[PDB]
Amino acid sequence: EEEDAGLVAEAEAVAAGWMLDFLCLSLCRAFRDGRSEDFRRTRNSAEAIIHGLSSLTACQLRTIYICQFLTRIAAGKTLDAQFENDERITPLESALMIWGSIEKEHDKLHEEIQNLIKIQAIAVCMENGNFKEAEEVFERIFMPFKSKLLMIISQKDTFHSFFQHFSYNHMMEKIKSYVNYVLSEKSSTFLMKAAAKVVESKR
Amino acid sequence: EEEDAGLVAEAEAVAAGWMLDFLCLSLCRAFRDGRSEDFRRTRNSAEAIIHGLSSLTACQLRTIYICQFLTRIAAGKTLDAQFENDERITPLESALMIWGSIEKEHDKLHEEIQNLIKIQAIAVCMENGNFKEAEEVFERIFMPFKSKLLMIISQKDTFHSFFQHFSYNHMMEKIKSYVNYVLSEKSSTFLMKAAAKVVESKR
Ligand SMILES: O=C(CN1CCNCC1)Nc1ccc(F)cc1
Ligand SMILES: O=C(CN1CCNCC1)Nc1ccc(F)cc1
Ligand SMILES: [Ca+2]
Ligand SMILES: [Ca+2]
């Protein structure tokens, strides 16, 4: 009776782990496809399942970080969203913090995404007319790119050509390339593989 | 490319269906065990997964109704909770409405649970001092039990002996017997069975 309850609780942790991987894969696919409402609904599901988990393996922490990272990137232009206990941290600064915390390879693509998030964190403040906020984001994040960015902030050059070369769309595209690699690695997770074989068996 | 997206969406509907059954089983077990915080967290998970589903089979509608029914019973003494668009409907009246909508057998246990919910819907108003509300709940729900209940409402007999014979604990116990039958039927669902075999394989 007591041992049965322990085995049931362990089984629930196994199923919750399978649910986390499934929801990360669906969140990644919605992000890549630009399906905004599916991403919103899947994010709600992922967040609730994460609250029902305690012990996490390193792989599960990485999966959670990826979900949190995409959530902040999707809300990158929503300067009213508070993703950290410190209310000053903007969504792209919060995305930057998680990006440098994921246990992943630091290849050329990693650094390009990192630098694009840094540039856009300032650019999204300038585009809203939040000039003093852009300076504060600059001080929290940060030679050649650094001095060009400070010059842009002081000149209030909102639509500066520098932000066209290193644009929001460019950041999204590079992030989507990374998302494609994550979708390839987790396409073999238990829940998706089982559902896939069921769909194929009915075709 | 377009056909692959259709097959992926179908696979997500299969996995979401498996998730619904799993969460109903975990919600039922938390209710039976009196694990309040696990029930709250599992309910949040079930509600989010239900928002990501469109087409429902009759079996899925029944599963959803059971989750909604237990949610209202758990909140039966929370007269500040609005479970319906009509703000006058109390949680036990809302539980009563779903109970008469489930496609299930109307055995002796069904009618006993139905009558206990009716009695307690009035009793929970009386215990809070909401005498006029109890009369209004009476008029919405409703000869021998009916006249005894109207006499109790007019006399303001909050702790009347009638409510001791047909008590809240009695309603919970009869509901838990039904929950035991639901746990037996869905213990064989795909996700729980797969997680169970994994846990057993490691023992
Ligand atoms: O963003 C958070 C909240 N959490 C992040 C770290 N600091 C504030 C607390 N969780 C989340 C999980 C999974 C998602 F898909 C989305 C959000
Ligand atoms: O209670 C509702 C809300 N819903 C019920 C019908 N009228 C108001 C809209 N959903 C729910 C689903 C699953 C749960 F586990 C808990 C609640
Ligand atoms: Ca703000
Ligand atoms: Ca009320």
Short mmCIF file of C-alpha atoms and ligand atoms in Angstrom, two decimals:
data_model
loop_
_atom_site.label_atom_id
_atom_site.label_comp_id
_atom_site.label_asym_id
_atom_site.label_seq_id
_atom_site.Cartn_x
_atom_site.Cartn_y
_atom_site.Cartn_z
CA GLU A 1 0.00 0.00 0.00
CA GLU A 2 2.83 2.41 0.89
CA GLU A 3 5.26 0.85 -1.66
CA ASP A 4 2.51 0.96 -4.34
CA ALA A 5 2.10 4.75 -3.75
CA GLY A 6 5.87 5.20 -4.18
CA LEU A 7 5.85 3.24 -7.45
CA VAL A 8 2.83 5.33 -8.65
CA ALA A 9 4.62 8.61 -7.79
CA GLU A 10 7.72 7.38 -9.66
CA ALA A 11 5.55 6.46 -12.70
CA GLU A 12 4.00 9.97 -12.63
CA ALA A 13 7.53 11.48 -12.66
CA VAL A 14 8.40 9.29 -15.74
CA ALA A 15 5.23 10.39 -17.62
CA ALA A 16 5.80 14.09 -16.63
CA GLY A 17 9.32 13.84 -18.08
CA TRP A 18 7.92 12.43 -21.35
CA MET A 19 5.34 15.28 -21.36
CA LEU A 20 8.07 17.96 -20.95
CA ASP A 21 10.02 16.69 -24.01
CA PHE A 22 6.80 16.47 -26.05
CA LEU A 23 5.75 20.05 -25.15
CA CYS A 24 9.29 21.41 -25.88
CA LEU A 25 9.17 19.80 -29.37
CA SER A 26 5.68 21.29 -30.02
CA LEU A 27 6.77 24.73 -28.72
CA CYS A 28 9.88 24.62 -30.99
CA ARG A 29 7.79 23.68 -34.05
CA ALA A 30 5.21 26.46 -33.33
CA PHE A 31 8.06 28.99 -32.96
CA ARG A 32 9.68 27.84 -36.24
CA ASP A 33 6.31 27.95 -38.10
CA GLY A 34 5.26 31.32 -36.62
CA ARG A 35 2.06 29.76 -35.16
CA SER A 36 1.61 32.42 -32.41
CA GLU A 37 -1.58 31.07 -30.80
CA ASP A 38 -0.35 27.44 -30.75
CA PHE A 39 2.93 28.68 -29.17
CA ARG A 40 0.93 30.61 -26.50
CA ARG A 41 -1.28 27.55 -25.67
CA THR A 42 1.69 25.10 -25.68
CA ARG A 43 3.72 27.47 -23.44
CA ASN A 44 0.85 27.45 -20.88
CA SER A 45 0.91 23.62 -20.97
CA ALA A 46 4.75 23.43 -20.60
CA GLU A 47 4.72 25.89 -17.66
CA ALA A 48 2.03 23.90 -15.77
CA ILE A 49 3.84 20.52 -16.31
CA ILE A 50 7.14 22.12 -15.10
CA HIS A 51 5.38 23.10 -11.80
CA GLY A 52 4.48 19.43 -11.23
CA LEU A 53 8.13 18.28 -11.46
CA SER A 54 10.70 18.40 -8.66
CA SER A 55 14.03 16.52 -9.33
CA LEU A 56 15.46 17.39 -12.74
CA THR A 57 18.15 15.69 -14.75
CA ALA A 58 20.69 17.92 -16.62
CA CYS A 59 18.87 17.08 -19.89
CA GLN A 60 15.52 18.25 -18.34
CA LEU A 61 17.10 21.52 -17.14
CA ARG A 62 18.40 22.13 -20.70
CA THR A 63 14.88 21.38 -22.13
CA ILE A 64 13.31 23.80 -19.62
CA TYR A 65 15.88 26.52 -20.46
CA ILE A 66 15.08 26.16 -24.18
CA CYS A 67 11.33 26.60 -23.44
CA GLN A 68 12.07 29.67 -21.26
CA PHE A 69 14.46 31.10 -23.92
CA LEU A 70 11.91 30.85 -26.74
CA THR A 71 9.22 32.37 -24.48
CA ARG A 72 11.36 35.51 -23.94
CA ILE A 73 12.36 35.80 -27.63
CA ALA A 74 8.62 35.61 -28.60
CA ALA A 75 7.97 38.44 -26.06
CA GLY A 76 11.15 40.41 -26.99
CA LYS A 77 9.22 43.50 -28.15
CA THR A 78 6.83 43.36 -25.11
CA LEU A 79 8.66 45.80 -22.80
CA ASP A 80 5.78 45.53 -20.24
CA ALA A 81 6.64 41.81 -19.54
CA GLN A 82 8.57 41.09 -16.34
CA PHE A 83 10.49 37.80 -16.74
CA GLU A 84 12.79 38.23 -13.70
CA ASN A 85 12.39 39.18 -10.00
CA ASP A 86 14.42 42.35 -10.82
CA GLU A 87 11.76 44.46 -12.63
CA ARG A 88 14.39 46.35 -14.66
CA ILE A 89 15.41 43.29 -16.77
CA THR A 90 13.87 43.41 -20.24
CA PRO A 91 12.74 40.21 -22.05
CA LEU A 92 15.76 40.09 -24.47
CA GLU A 93 18.18 40.65 -21.48
CA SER A 94 16.44 37.71 -19.75
CA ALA A 95 16.77 35.62 -23.01
CA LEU A 96 20.50 36.60 -23.09
CA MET A 97 20.97 35.35 -19.44
CA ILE A 98 19.43 31.92 -20.22
CA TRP A 99 21.38 31.65 -23.53
CA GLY A 100 24.71 31.90 -21.60
CA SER A 101 23.44 29.30 -19.03
CA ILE A 102 22.45 26.45 -21.38
CA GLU A 103 24.92 23.54 -21.41
CA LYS A 104 25.41 23.61 -25.19
CA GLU A 105 28.33 24.02 -27.65
CA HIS A 106 29.58 27.56 -28.21
CA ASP A 107 29.83 27.29 -32.00
CA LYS A 108 29.79 30.28 -34.50
CA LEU A 109 25.94 30.18 -34.49
CA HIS A 110 25.84 30.46 -30.64
CA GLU A 111 27.92 33.71 -30.68
CA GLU A 112 26.02 35.22 -33.62
CA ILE A 113 22.68 34.66 -31.78
CA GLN A 114 24.25 36.09 -28.57
CA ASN A 115 25.43 39.29 -30.37
CA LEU A 116 22.13 39.71 -32.22
CA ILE A 117 20.17 39.49 -28.90
CA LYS A 118 22.53 42.13 -27.39
CA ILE A 119 22.03 44.56 -30.30
CA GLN A 120 18.27 44.04 -30.41
CA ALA A 121 17.90 44.44 -26.61
CA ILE A 122 19.00 48.08 -27.12
CA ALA A 123 17.21 48.53 -30.51
CA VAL A 124 13.77 47.51 -29.08
CA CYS A 125 14.11 50.27 -26.42
CA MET A 126 15.05 52.89 -29.04
CA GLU A 127 12.09 51.96 -31.29
CA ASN A 128 9.67 52.58 -28.39
CA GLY A 129 11.25 56.00 -27.58
CA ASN A 130 12.74 54.54 -24.35
CA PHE A 131 16.16 56.30 -24.82
CA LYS A 132 17.20 56.33 -21.13
CA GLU A 133 16.14 52.66 -20.79
CA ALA A 134 18.36 51.75 -23.84
CA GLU A 135 21.34 53.39 -22.07
CA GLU A 136 20.61 51.34 -18.91
CA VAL A 137 20.26 48.09 -20.92
CA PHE A 138 23.61 49.06 -22.60
CA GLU A 139 25.31 49.46 -19.19
CA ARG A 140 24.00 46.09 -17.98
CA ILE A 141 25.04 44.19 -21.14
CA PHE A 142 28.35 45.92 -22.04
CA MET A 143 35.03 47.70 -28.25
CA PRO A 144 34.01 48.42 -31.94
CA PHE A 145 30.34 47.27 -31.68
CA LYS A 146 30.18 48.71 -28.12
CA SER A 147 31.21 52.25 -29.20
CA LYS A 148 28.93 52.22 -32.28
CA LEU A 149 25.99 51.29 -30.00
CA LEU A 150 26.71 54.07 -27.44
CA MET A 151 26.94 56.61 -30.30
CA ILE A 152 23.54 55.41 -31.61
CA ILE A 153 21.93 55.71 -28.14
CA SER A 154 23.22 59.30 -27.58
CA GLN A 155 22.19 60.41 -31.09
CA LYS A 156 18.66 58.91 -30.60
CA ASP A 157 19.07 57.32 -34.08
CA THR A 158 16.11 54.90 -33.70
CA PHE A 159 16.12 53.59 -37.30
CA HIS A 160 19.92 53.61 -37.65
CA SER A 161 21.33 51.52 -40.55
CA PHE A 162 23.29 49.38 -38.00
CA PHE A 163 19.99 47.98 -36.71
CA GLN A 164 19.01 47.06 -40.35
CA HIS A 165 22.18 44.89 -40.81
CA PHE A 166 21.70 43.28 -37.37
CA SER A 167 17.88 43.32 -37.40
CA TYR A 168 15.12 41.60 -35.35
CA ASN A 169 14.27 39.42 -38.40
CA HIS A 170 17.97 38.39 -38.64
CA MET A 171 17.93 37.39 -34.92
CA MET A 172 14.66 35.39 -35.46
CA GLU A 173 16.11 33.63 -38.53
CA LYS A 174 19.36 32.64 -36.74
CA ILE A 175 17.31 31.46 -33.71
CA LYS A 176 15.06 29.38 -36.04
CA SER A 177 18.21 27.61 -37.44
CA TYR A 178 19.07 26.57 -33.83
CA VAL A 179 15.44 25.53 -33.23
CA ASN A 180 15.73 23.23 -36.29
CA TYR A 181 18.69 21.45 -34.69
CA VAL A 182 16.69 21.04 -31.36
CA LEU A 183 13.66 19.65 -33.31
CA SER A 184 15.98 17.08 -34.98
CA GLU A 185 17.41 15.88 -31.62
CA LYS A 186 14.03 15.52 -29.81
CA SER A 187 12.02 14.14 -32.79
CA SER A 188 12.96 10.69 -31.37
CA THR A 189 11.56 11.35 -27.86
CA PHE A 190 9.15 8.62 -26.56
CA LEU A 191 5.75 10.43 -26.78
CA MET A 192 6.24 11.91 -30.30
CA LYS A 193 7.67 8.60 -31.66
CA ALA A 194 4.71 6.60 -30.23
CA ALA A 195 2.09 9.10 -31.56
CA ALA A 196 3.91 9.15 -34.94
CA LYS A 197 3.71 5.34 -35.31
CA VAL A 198 -0.01 5.44 -34.46
CA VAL A 199 -0.74 8.08 -37.13
CA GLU A 200 1.32 6.15 -39.71
CA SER A 201 -0.43 2.86 -38.82
CA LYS A 202 -3.81 4.46 -39.72
CA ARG A 203 -2.58 5.80 -43.14
CA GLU B 1 5.98 19.49 -46.65
CA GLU B 2 2.25 20.27 -46.32
CA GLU B 3 1.31 16.57 -45.78
CA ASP B 4 4.12 16.24 -43.18
CA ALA B 5 2.62 19.19 -41.20
CA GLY B 6 -0.79 17.47 -41.25
CA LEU B 7 0.70 14.20 -39.98
CA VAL B 8 2.58 16.17 -37.23
CA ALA B 9 -0.63 17.96 -36.15
CA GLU B 10 -2.43 14.59 -36.04
CA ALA B 11 0.41 13.11 -33.92
CA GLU B 12 0.13 16.08 -31.51
CA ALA B 13 -3.63 15.39 -31.17
CA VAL B 14 -2.84 11.69 -30.34
CA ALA B 15 -0.26 12.68 -27.67
CA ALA B 16 -2.63 15.37 -26.21
CA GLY B 17 -5.32 12.69 -25.89
CA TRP B 18 -2.88 10.40 -24.03
CA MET B 19 -1.95 13.39 -21.79
CA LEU B 20 -5.63 14.08 -20.91
CA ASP B 21 -6.20 10.47 -19.71
CA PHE B 22 -2.94 10.54 -17.72
CA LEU B 23 -3.84 13.85 -16.00
CA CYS B 24 -7.41 12.62 -15.22
CA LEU B 25 -5.95 9.50 -13.54
CA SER B 26 -3.49 11.64 -11.50
CA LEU B 27 -6.25 14.11 -10.54
CA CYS B 28 -8.51 11.20 -9.43
CA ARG B 29 -5.71 9.66 -7.31
CA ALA B 30 -4.87 13.06 -5.68
CA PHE B 31 -8.59 13.57 -4.88
CA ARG B 32 -8.89 10.05 -3.38
CA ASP B 33 -5.69 10.52 -1.30
CA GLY B 34 -6.58 14.06 -0.15
CA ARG B 35 -3.34 15.46 -1.67
CA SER B 36 -4.66 19.05 -2.04
CA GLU B 37 -1.54 20.68 -3.54
CA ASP B 38 -0.94 17.84 -6.05
CA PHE B 39 -4.64 18.11 -7.07
CA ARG B 40 -4.26 21.91 -7.54
CA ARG B 41 -1.09 21.51 -9.69
CA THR B 42 -2.54 18.58 -11.74
CA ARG B 43 -5.79 20.54 -12.32
CA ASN B 44 -3.73 23.45 -13.78
CA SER B 45 -2.01 20.94 -16.11
CA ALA B 46 -5.32 19.28 -17.19
CA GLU B 47 -6.94 22.69 -17.89
CA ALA B 48 -4.02 23.84 -20.09
CA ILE B 49 -3.95 20.54 -22.11
CA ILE B 50 -7.77 20.78 -22.62
CA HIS B 51 -7.27 24.27 -24.21
CA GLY B 52 -4.89 22.71 -26.77
CA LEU B 53 -7.50 20.16 -27.95
CA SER B 54 -10.28 20.80 -30.47
CA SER B 55 -12.19 17.66 -31.71
CA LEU B 56 -13.24 15.43 -28.82
CA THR B 57 -14.44 11.87 -28.82
CA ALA B 58 -17.36 10.94 -26.46
CA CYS B 59 -14.81 9.21 -24.17
CA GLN B 60 -12.70 12.46 -24.03
CA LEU B 61 -15.80 14.55 -23.18
CA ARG B 62 -16.58 12.12 -20.32
CA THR B 63 -12.93 12.37 -19.08
CA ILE B 64 -13.11 16.19 -19.21
CA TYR B 65 -16.46 16.20 -17.33
CA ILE B 66 -14.93 14.02 -14.58
CA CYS B 67 -12.01 16.49 -14.20
CA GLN B 68 -14.45 19.45 -14.08
CA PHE B 69 -16.72 17.60 -11.58
CA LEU B 70 -13.89 16.85 -9.14
CA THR B 71 -12.64 20.47 -9.44
CA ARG B 72 -16.04 21.80 -8.28
CA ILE B 73 -16.40 19.22 -5.46
CA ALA B 74 -12.89 20.22 -4.18
CA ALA B 75 -14.08 23.89 -4.23
CA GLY B 76 -17.58 23.09 -2.86
CA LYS B 77 -17.12 25.21 0.29
CA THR B 78 -15.52 28.12 -1.70
CA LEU B 79 -18.64 30.26 -2.26
CA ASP B 80 -16.46 33.01 -3.87
CA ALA B 81 -15.61 30.69 -6.87
CA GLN B 82 -17.52 31.34 -10.10
CA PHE B 83 -17.61 28.13 -12.19
CA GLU B 84 -20.35 29.24 -14.64
CA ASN B 85 -21.09 32.33 -16.79
CA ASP B 86 -24.17 32.89 -14.55
CA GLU B 87 -22.51 34.32 -11.39
CA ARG B 88 -25.31 33.04 -9.12
CA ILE B 89 -24.42 29.32 -9.60
CA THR B 90 -22.53 27.94 -6.61
CA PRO B 91 -19.75 25.31 -7.03
CA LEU B 92 -21.89 22.34 -5.79
CA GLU B 93 -24.78 23.43 -8.15
CA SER B 94 -22.21 23.46 -10.99
CA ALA B 95 -20.97 19.96 -9.87
CA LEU B 96 -24.66 18.81 -9.85
CA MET B 97 -25.13 20.07 -13.49
CA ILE B 98 -22.07 18.13 -14.77
CA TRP B 99 -23.06 15.00 -12.76
CA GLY B 100 -26.41 14.82 -14.65
CA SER B 101 -24.56 15.36 -18.01
CA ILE B 102 -21.97 12.56 -17.82
CA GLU B 103 -22.77 9.56 -20.05
CA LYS B 104 -22.57 7.02 -17.21
CA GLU B 105 -24.87 4.40 -15.60
CA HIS B 106 -27.49 5.72 -13.18
CA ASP B 107 -26.92 3.07 -10.50
CA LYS B 108 -27.82 3.42 -6.73
CA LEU B 109 -24.43 5.14 -6.11
CA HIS B 110 -25.14 7.75 -8.86
CA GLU B 111 -28.44 8.84 -7.17
CA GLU B 112 -26.97 8.83 -3.66
CA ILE B 113 -24.13 11.17 -4.82
CA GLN B 114 -26.71 13.34 -6.65
CA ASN B 115 -28.90 13.70 -3.49
CA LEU B 116 -25.90 14.34 -1.24
CA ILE B 117 -24.67 17.16 -3.56
CA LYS B 118 -28.21 18.69 -3.49
CA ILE B 119 -28.39 18.65 0.33
CA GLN B 120 -24.85 19.98 0.75
CA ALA B 121 -25.38 22.77 -1.82
CA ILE B 122 -27.93 24.25 0.63
CA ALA B 123 -25.98 23.24 3.81
CA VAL B 124 -22.77 25.07 2.69
CA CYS B 125 -24.80 28.32 2.33
CA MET B 126 -26.37 27.91 5.79
CA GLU B 127 -22.97 27.28 7.45
CA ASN B 128 -21.66 30.59 6.05
CA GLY B 129 -24.75 32.53 7.28
CA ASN B 130 -25.94 32.94 3.65
CA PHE B 131 -29.64 32.19 4.51
CA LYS B 132 -31.21 34.02 1.53
CA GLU B 133 -28.66 32.40 -0.83
CA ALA B 134 -29.64 28.90 0.54
CA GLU B 135 -33.29 29.67 -0.32
CA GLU B 136 -32.27 30.68 -3.87
CA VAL B 137 -30.12 27.53 -4.30
CA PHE B 138 -33.18 25.56 -3.00
CA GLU B 139 -35.44 27.15 -5.66
CA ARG B 140 -32.97 26.38 -8.45
CA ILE B 141 -32.44 22.73 -7.40
CA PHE B 142 -35.96 21.74 -6.23
CA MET B 143 -41.50 15.92 -1.56
CA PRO B 144 -40.29 14.55 1.88
CA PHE B 145 -36.62 15.67 1.61
CA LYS B 146 -37.77 18.87 -0.17
CA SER B 147 -40.11 19.96 2.68
CA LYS B 148 -37.57 19.08 5.41
CA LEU B 149 -34.98 21.27 3.60
CA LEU B 150 -37.34 24.28 3.26
CA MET B 151 -38.21 24.00 6.98
CA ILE B 152 -34.46 23.99 7.83
CA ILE B 153 -33.81 27.09 5.65
CA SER B 154 -36.68 29.11 7.23
CA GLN B 155 -35.69 28.10 10.78
CA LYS B 156 -32.01 29.08 10.09
CA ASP B 157 -31.02 25.72 11.68
CA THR B 158 -27.40 25.79 10.41
CA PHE B 159 -26.17 22.71 12.34
CA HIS B 160 -29.42 20.75 11.95
CA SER B 161 -29.18 16.99 12.61
CA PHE B 162 -30.34 16.31 8.99
CA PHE B 163 -27.05 17.75 7.71
CA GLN B 164 -25.14 15.35 10.09
CA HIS B 165 -26.82 12.24 8.53
CA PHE B 166 -26.26 13.58 4.99
CA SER B 167 -22.95 15.35 5.70
CA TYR B 168 -20.12 16.80 3.56
CA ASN B 169 -17.84 13.93 4.67
CA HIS B 170 -20.54 11.41 3.56
CA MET B 171 -20.70 13.12 0.11
CA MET B 172 -16.84 13.02 -0.15
CA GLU B 173 -16.75 9.33 0.83
CA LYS B 174 -19.44 8.32 -1.71
CA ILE B 175 -17.65 10.41 -4.40
CA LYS B 176 -14.32 8.68 -3.52
CA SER B 177 -16.00 5.24 -4.11
CA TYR B 178 -16.90 6.43 -7.66
CA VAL B 179 -13.37 7.82 -8.13
CA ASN B 180 -12.02 4.33 -7.28
CA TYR B 181 -14.06 2.83 -10.13
CA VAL B 182 -12.71 5.57 -12.57
CA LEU B 183 -9.10 4.88 -11.42
CA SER B 184 -9.64 1.14 -12.16
CA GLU B 185 -10.92 1.81 -15.72
CA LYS B 186 -8.13 4.27 -16.73
CA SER B 187 -5.22 2.47 -14.96
CA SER B 188 -4.70 0.74 -18.36
CA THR B 189 -4.41 3.99 -20.37
CA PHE B 190 -1.28 4.18 -22.64
CA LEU B 191 0.88 6.76 -20.75
CA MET B 192 0.40 5.27 -17.23
CA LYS B 193 0.91 1.68 -18.51
CA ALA B 194 4.16 2.66 -20.33
CA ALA B 195 5.52 4.62 -17.29
CA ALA B 196 4.50 1.71 -15.00
CA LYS B 197 6.50 -0.84 -17.06
CA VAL B 198 9.54 1.47 -16.99
CA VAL B 199 9.43 1.81 -13.18
CA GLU B 200 8.98 -1.97 -12.78
CA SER B 201 11.86 -2.68 -15.20
CA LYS B 202 14.22 -0.68 -12.92
CA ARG B 203 13.13 -2.53 -9.70
O1 LIG C 1 9.67 31.82 -17.58
C1 LIG C 1 9.45 31.09 -16.63
C2 LIG C 1 9.48 31.63 -15.21
N1 LIG C 1 10.72 31.41 -14.47
C3 LIG C 1 11.91 31.67 -15.29
C4 LIG C 1 13.14 32.05 -14.46
N2 LIG C 1 12.91 33.29 -13.69
C5 LIG C 1 11.48 33.53 -13.41
C6 LIG C 1 10.73 32.21 -13.24
N3 LIG C 1 9.06 29.80 -16.76
C7 LIG C 1 8.62 29.20 -17.96
C8 LIG C 1 8.80 27.84 -18.16
C9 LIG C 1 8.42 27.25 -19.35
C10 LIG C 1 7.90 28.04 -20.33
F1 LIG C 1 7.51 27.46 -21.50
C11 LIG C 1 7.72 29.39 -20.19
C12 LIG C 1 8.11 29.98 -19.00
O1 LIG C 2 -14.00 24.20 -15.13
C1 LIG C 2 -13.63 24.44 -16.27
C2 LIG C 2 -14.16 25.65 -17.02
N1 LIG C 2 -15.27 25.40 -17.93
C3 LIG C 2 -16.28 24.51 -17.35
C4 LIG C 2 -17.67 24.70 -17.97
N2 LIG C 2 -18.18 26.07 -17.75
C5 LIG C 2 -17.09 27.05 -17.56
C6 LIG C 2 -15.86 26.67 -18.38
N3 LIG C 2 -12.68 23.72 -16.90
C7 LIG C 2 -11.81 22.80 -16.28
C8 LIG C 2 -11.30 21.73 -17.01
C9 LIG C 2 -10.50 20.79 -16.40
C10 LIG C 2 -10.23 20.92 -15.07
F1 LIG C 2 -9.42 20.00 -14.47
C11 LIG C 2 -10.72 21.94 -14.31
C12 LIG C 2 -11.54 22.88 -14.92
CA CA C 3 9.03 47.87 -18.85
CA CA C 4 -20.61 33.86 -4.04
#
